[PDB]
Write a protein that binds this ligand. Structure first.
Ligand SMILES: CC(=O)N[C@H]1[C@H]([C@H](O)[C@H](O)CO)O[C@@](OC[C@H]2O[C@@H](O)[C@H](O)[C@@H](O)[C@H]2O)(C(=O)O)C[C@@H]1O
Ligand SMILES: CC(=O)N[C@H]1[C@H]([C@H](O)[C@H](O)CO)O[C@@](O)(C(=O)O)C[C@@H]1O
Ligand SMILES: CC(=O)N[C@H]1[C@H]([C@H](O)[C@H](O)CO)O[C@@](O)(C(=O)O)C[C@@H]1O
Ligand SMILES: CC(=O)N[C@H]1[C@H]([C@H](O)[C@H](O)CO)O[C@@](O)(C(=O)O)C[C@@H]1O
Lengths: 264, 272, 271, 270, 264
């Protein structure tokens, strides 16, 4: 796309506000364990690694239809204000959990692994397959989107194994990451803090704007008047009384500012 | 909805408001033992029977401060409003955590220090021209709050509240009443409030705290406009959990600290 | 104080250099255990919480007299010293690189001695008058009467576990005001700048820096530093770097000294 | 001695690549790719002989740049100058996996141990091979279980510090060992390198990924790496921790790294 | 020194490159255990605290002769690029050490206390004595430089106990620190991260320049055309099979830029 001048004047800006609920594994808001995974199970061996249905976190994603337009004009994403919602819900140590100090102390708070990422773009987020175990069998849940073939080389980067993030709550985070060789029209940001019982470290404010313009002063350009938003926000595990553990995720809010851009 | 006009200049066009808010950890009566702590934490028998005892639940601190009355005639073409420009805020009493002789569990086979207050930290404050707007979100939709009918929670529960369900909202209008565990700032609203928060979890995590009288937080938005104080009210809210006190037998209580605010405001003309 | 212009020209600047030794509880430089507290003891209950003499860290403080400025008091203005900036450092950080002292040790009596570790508390203040204090304690019933030299309120009340503004003081004596129950009063201290940090936990790694290259600006938002009333400069601090763990598990606070180099300038004010 | 930038058509070029990790099992057609073989421990310092495949090595490639004239009799010549790089660790999200066949938490009821522990991350971009200094924790380490590793032919006590007689160039992928070769700070004037180490036993990995960060390769004088012989040299290592097997056996885990490098033509004196 | 203007023209700049090997206790490069301390021992009581020979880290230092000059002209140190060398050597978990998970897991990596300092000056680093134990007896090693008299007050700052860092591998870190009341003509930078088994956190790059100019734009001025460089870099302890522990140190590289300065 050949990018020309900005369109000036009264109707040249618009904003899109949305939230995405977490996709930790039980993703139906009417059913038990919503906002958590099902209980984590552990493979007996690498060739018998078959996660149960609902124990696998997946990416949240939405495509938002933008106001009608129409050299052509496209919406250009300029900036985003994004927040993790419900951080204070983690201030809860009276749930039915394992507890400290010979059954007398606090319940374990949600703790452990944190994974936080978001992406804003003008087309679907482009994905690269990469897994800790090439033999992982996802057949317990046919709604997951994974490659049809398995190969040893996918424990590294094999560029024959790619996808696009086109469906909410379906692409496992454990085997799909952003493709850094593409995504020219998307901006993504992510972080991982691992370990077993690591303290979650989280912030929330309504005062931070993230600029989405690239080094040339150009934001994501919304092809077919679609804005694509994606994320995942794992805040740790809930540890049940018997030691069974579930992923816990939180929703993410977005407020995206867009402007009209003339293109050739 | 408020159309903002020009700043009123000259002398007397600025004012400052100073206050502190004491912590609301659960034992919130300053005349009783255990003030500034929660009651001992208990743990649910099951997720269906999750009923916190009265006073074991931290809540937000909040106040509405009356500002100097600007308008004798409320039917004038324009009016003057107080606009919050900046705030200096600090947690008070951080040095009180340098205490390891209290009646607590202790290190090294009963020969070492008492356990200092440690574990989960949660710090937030908000300054606005109207009450802080809240979104309900909980780790357990079934939590039963009926042991304390002074708490403000939604009148019905549903599975979906373990995520973001925008049908469950509120406004922070009462001190010591809205549980932190189920109410958070609503990011889809709060156009006229600025809020800042952090959480550091884990079981016995070291508290990491700072205090100074030299830091100013700017409250002006992207357009150079601060919170506008509707009806000459300034709304300040916070929560500062610094960890748990571990008693001799392992029983634990939240510990909170007060927060101080020094807010600078200026007169702004607005359309009436 | 109505602050007017800076005084220019020769001798319009001066510097003050000092250090303050730590006041961890054993505060006599001629005695063993200097720079440490006495052994920490622990209350059996909150109504029998009575620290032993010397187990309680207190603030260090000094007043430094500055060159006199105002012989004439009948004129429209006066001159005050204004503290512009300070270079401050904790001294002796390298002394913590010591794992052969008589301490508990790692790995079934084969490994290193425990280094000094655990709680860190670091604060300093520079002002033109004594640091103003607010009382706040983790236990309102703490009985300080084993050491009557500690400056504490004469009465106890439940409300002092939060902020009760009827319980205030000024830091007017070195090695006497417990850090555990006195903090800076944020509603005052207009003429002081203070900076503090706390890192808690049981055996937490101390994280410490030392350099002679950092200047802290003491000017406020209006460009005005602390103004030294009666030509007095007040400097206060506390620097706890953790606990020494003895062989049997007995523990003592360890503190370090703090160095200060303060730049001051002459400022005209209204009389 | 650099002169001015060349201007005009085809005076800019870009190089895009990735490097797969070299943790020890470096064959993409076999099981356990991107991990080391099981770690073993020496009985004593004089019999410290790592097994074949348990030792991470640097990843490296030389990339051909568009060919320029190299006549040694010319007054000036053109060279490619590397200006900036965008680089990211790939597959960080793969660490969100606690159902692998691993030791597990809470009396065999909790999560599998995630990959955790030591992190080592470094990359380099230069106009010649990365210059290496030998330095080891044990001068007597015996590398003879794998003769494909590049190590010095003689061992000496001084190599537990910096002995400048023990140097190399990073000229082969998967060969190299990280444990005994580091970037030489006394050379590498024509390379930029960046590295970090976080140690400990079960330390949480802390990792970030984004496509929004550009690393400037220009030095204090405004000059980037100059590509001798029209070669661009890219090197890295990204260890993200250990996988802990059911019986406590442990393997290094590494991740690939992506690079996008911008270059421009620079006139130099000859 | 009254500082005047910079000298301009050819040969007004020079650079000095060097490295300093660590002085952890076994400081002979021909012997086993070079770059480590001897095994750490622990006093039975504070009045019988007598470290063994070689278990005590000391500062590394050097004086470098600069090109001869000669108002007078002096060399002024402007900036330094400095790096800890051999960080990657800590990626080694097969040494003869204690190991994880019931003798099946990795050897313990070098871990625990980190201490990092360097100084660049135009005269010797000025030191202040301060110790955790005034009674420490250094007589097992007569090559160490320590005060001849012991006193209780030396557990705080006693300004009657000072020295200058004039000998490599002789001044113990545990009782000598930079004197903040002097060192006007030196820049020093240090950090300590303590604890028992703390993860070392270390960086290495050839892209960072440390500016040595003070608030007045003046760097260290090299008296008698001597440049003084000092450091210590403790990266943790090596834990032997039986639990015996030794300090591990790493060398430090310096590239210092100097310029000619006119002085009165
Ligand atoms: C903070 C506090 O109250 N300290 C007490 C201390 C502690 O109660 C105890 O040492 C635990 O660390 O006890 C002190 O008295 C010790 C003394 O107490 C009597 O009750 C008992 O009969 C004696 O045998 C002996 O235990 C102490 O000095 O340690 C007093 C101190 O106030
Ligand atoms: C969170 C919760 O449900 N708390 C309940 C507790 C705990 O189940 C136990 O004390 C175990 O800690 O038991 C009570 O009888 C009590 O102590 O008053 C009722 C209370 O509602
Ligand atoms: C670093 C080292 O020397 N490893 C050696 C190991 C270990 O001593 C044991 O496996 C204990 O882990 O023993 C070997 O027989 C082996 O496993 O093949 C030889 C190998 O050289
Ligand atoms: C710091 C100290 O005083 N070390 C002393 C040690 C220790 O008391 C024990 O070894 C316990 O580690 O005992 C010695 O006999 C020794 O080992 O050579 C003498 C030495 O002076």
């Amino acid at each position: 796309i050949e990018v020309l001048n900005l369109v000036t004047g009264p109707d040249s800006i618009t904003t899109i506000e949305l939230y995405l609920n977490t996709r930790m594994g039980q993703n139906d808001e009417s059913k038990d364990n919503y906002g958590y995974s099902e209980k984590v199970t552990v493979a007996n061996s690498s060739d018998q690694d078959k996660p149960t249905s609902g124990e696998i976190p997946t990416y949240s994603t939405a495509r938002i239809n933008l106001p009608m337009l129409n050299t052509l004009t496209m919406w250009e994403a300029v900036s985003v204000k994004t927040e993790v919602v419900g951080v204070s819900s983690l201030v809860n140590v009276h749930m039915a959990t394992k507890r400290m100090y010979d059954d007398k102390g606090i319940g374990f708070p949600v703790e452990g692994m944190n994974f936080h990422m978001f992406a804003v773009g003008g087309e679907p987020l482009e994905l690269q397959f990469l897994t800790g175990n090439y033999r992982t069998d996802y057949s317990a849940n046919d709604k997951l989107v994974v490659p049809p073939i398995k190969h040893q080389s996918t424990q590294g980067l094999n560029p024959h194994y790619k996808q696009k993030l086109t469906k909410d709550g379906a692409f496992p985070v454990e085997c799909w990451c952003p493709d850094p060789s593409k995504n020219e029209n998307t901006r993504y940001y992510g972080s991982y803090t691992g370990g077993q019982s690591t303290p979650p470290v989280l912030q929330f404010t309504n005062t931070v704007t993230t600029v989405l313009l690239d080094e040339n002063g150009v934001g994501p350009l919304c092809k077919g008047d679609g804005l694509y938003v994606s994320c995942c926000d794992i805040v740790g595990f809930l540890v049940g009384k018997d030691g069974d553990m579930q992923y816990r995720g939180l929703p993410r809010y977005f407020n995206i500012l867009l402007r009209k851009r003339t293109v050739r």
